[PDB]
Write a protein that binds this DNA or RNA. Sequence first.
RNA 1: ACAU
DNA 2: CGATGT
Length: 136
Amino acid sequence: EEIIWESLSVDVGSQGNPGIVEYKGVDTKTGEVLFEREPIPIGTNNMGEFLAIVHGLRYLKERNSRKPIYSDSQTAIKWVKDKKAKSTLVRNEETALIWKLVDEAEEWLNTHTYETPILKWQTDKWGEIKADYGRK
RNA sequence: ACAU
DNA sequence: CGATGT
Ligand SMILES: [Cl-]
Ligand SMILES: [Cl-]
Ligand SMILES: [Cl-]
Ligand SMILES: [Li+]
Ligand SMILES: [Mg+2]
Ligand SMILES: [Mg+2]
């Protein structure tokens, strides 16, 4: 398995889980940050991974790009394939923002088409995904 | 068990 | 050590 360098890599980072969630997408080859979401006060790791992939799909579609997306999240790759994010996070006023984003991301997937391959980054062979946040 |  | 997920 060769890395597909002509691709977009996404990943989540957080302070607490559940906690403050952010995510970003980078050029897999150069590491250039192509988008980064403003921190969301309360969410889960998997919600952030999910939003990161969907944002990537929207980013590539808008730019007429056929590049694949790498994610390291087994969970979020499945959620995108299903068009359904099966998060356990409670719905309350503190989690309303992220739940609105998740609901809207599902809605986008149910109203648009894409051919973008969503690929599992093979961390065991390649090391950390290039969008990883690391340690604070 | 696997993945974050 | 615990949390989010299949
Ligand atoms: Cl978002
Ligand atoms: Cl997977
Ligand atoms: Cl591909
Ligand atoms: Li990740
Ligand atoms: Mg990471
Ligand atoms: Mg980390």
